[PDB]
């Protein structure tokens, strides 16, 4: 069995980082994999120190016996992923718990967008209003829904992306959902956004039935 540390690694370009893989019993080799959310693990380093095809010289693997490590000389934004170690000295082959690498960057305010219900959805008797927060950092962000300047509760759901491989940012979408009947009982629909990159809350709004 395998153990990796730390569970989460946080770094800035281009710091030097290392992550370890410890085995219960001694092994001949350790193989490393890189996985990003939504996709399959990619072979990264095989036979302890050999880079897979297309892996930056920046990466390197080392270790022997029961202790092994992966090292990134000068980390870059695209390196944001989870790294697994793997053993195949005895059966069955096993994987490590994984080390997750996060990238540090400067503060970026979110670009905010709002989308009224589509005419198709409205005809079905439901109204979903979507607020979009694009490419911000850090991850922490607060979205408040105000309907005719009345703070909403219980009628919205939000989701955040994984870290962007190119600019190390995050994106968020919040969806406000009302019945068609309730939706046309009000006029102003707004989402208020607070984030570290903003000195004061930013509001995006529309008037229902006005174009």
């Amino acid at each position: 069995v395998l153990s990796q540390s730390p569970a989460i690694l946080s770094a800035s370009p281009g710091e030097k980082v290392t992550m370890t893989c410890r085995a219960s019993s001694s092994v001949s080799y350790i193989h490393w994999f890189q996985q990003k959310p939504g996709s399959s693990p990619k072979p990264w380093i095989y036979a302890t120190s050999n880079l897979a095809s297309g892996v930056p010289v920046r990466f390197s693997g080392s270790g022997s016996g029961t202790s092994y490590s992966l090292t990134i000389s000068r980390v870059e934004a695209e390196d944001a992923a989870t790294y697994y170690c793997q053993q195949w000295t005895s059966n069955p082959p096993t994987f490590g718990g994984g080390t997750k690498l996060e990238i540090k960057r400067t503060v970026a305010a979110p670009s905010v967008f709002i989308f009224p219900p589509s005419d198709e959805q409205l005809k079905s008797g439901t109204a979903s209003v979507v607020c979009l927060l694009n490419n911000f950092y850090p991850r922490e962000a607060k979205v408040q829904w105000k309907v005719d300047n009345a703070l909403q509760s219980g009628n919205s759901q939000e989701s955040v992306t994984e870290q962007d491989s190119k600019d190390s940012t995050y994106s968020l979408s919040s969806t406000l959902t009302l019945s068609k009947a309730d939706y046309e009982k009000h006029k102003v629909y707004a989402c208020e956004v607070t984030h570290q990159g903003l000195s004061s809350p930013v509001t995006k709004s529309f008037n229902r039935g006005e174009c």
Binding site: S28, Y29, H31, F33, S39, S40, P41, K42, P43, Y46, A47, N50, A52, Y84, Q86, W88, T89, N91, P92, P93, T94, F95, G96, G97, G98, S111, F113, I114, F115, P116, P117, S118, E120, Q121, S124, S128, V130, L132, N134, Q157, E158, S159, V160, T161, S171, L172, S173, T175, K204, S205, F206
Partner: protein, 221 residues
């Protein structure tokens, strides 16, 4: 190039059984073992077993000796893994994987995309795909945001691409949110030049395999 063809997802009732396929390409099928790996957020990555398509020989991890049944269509270059008596523990992404030899040891060098299995008594639900149309309240520094609301489906996952995969830059497909009804909803957005909005066509391609949903929605101003 070595490719492993794997179906998207399977909704499976508790107590029933499931058989998922793995169509191999780009290499001599019967000359290499085929492996099967399970992934959960809890137990992580776990090797299940392996079949030799050369002559139908199999080997299993101790835990999955009852769950998994490995076969291989020697003629179709397709490997199958059958799981039986499915319980909530069997809800996972299942990968078929090729291995390769180096320094006397082995490692998984080629992986399939994975099959997401959901063990539930709940019924499948196809999503409704609504456009998130570009507006003036959707306009930032010469760019416009637009997207698609993939609304009310079960179970996971939904895959979304833009313009048949030709548009990837600036695309944000958010993780699905779980609704009180047990259904899921998802949205995918993308920022485009607001200047070419009258000449460019932006279509989201929504796929929900367990409900046979394959939908193209045009999102326009």
């Amino acid at each position: 190039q070595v490719q492993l063809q794997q179906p998207g997802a399977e909704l499976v009732k508790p107590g029933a059984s499931v058989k998922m396929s793995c169509k191999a390409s780009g290499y001599t099928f019967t000359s290499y073992n085929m492996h099967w790996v399970k992934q959960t957020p809890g137990r992580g990555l776990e090797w299940i077993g392996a079949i030799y398509p050369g002559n139908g020989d199999t080997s299993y991890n101790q835990k999955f000796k009852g769950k998994a049944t490995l076969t291989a269509d020697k003629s179709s270059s397709t490997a199958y893994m059958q799981l039986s008596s499915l319980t909530s523990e069997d809800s996972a992404v299942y990968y078929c994987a090729r291995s390769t030899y180096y320094g006397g040891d082995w490692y998984f060098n080629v992986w399939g995309a994975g099959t997401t299995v959901t063990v539930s008594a709940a019924s499948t639900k196809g999503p409704s795909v609504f456009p998130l149309a570009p507006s003036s309240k959707s306009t930032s520094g010469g760019t416009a945001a637009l997207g698609c609301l993939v609304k009310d489906y079960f179970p996971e996952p939904v895959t979304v691409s833009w313009n048949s995969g030709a548009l990837t830059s600036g695309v944000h497909t958010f993780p699905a949110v779980l609704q009180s009804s047990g259904l899921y909803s998802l949205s995918s957005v993308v920022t485009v030049p607001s200047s070419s909005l009258g000449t460019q066509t932006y279509i989201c391609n929504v796929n929900h395999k367990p409900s046979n949903t394959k939908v193209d929605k045009k999102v326009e101003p």
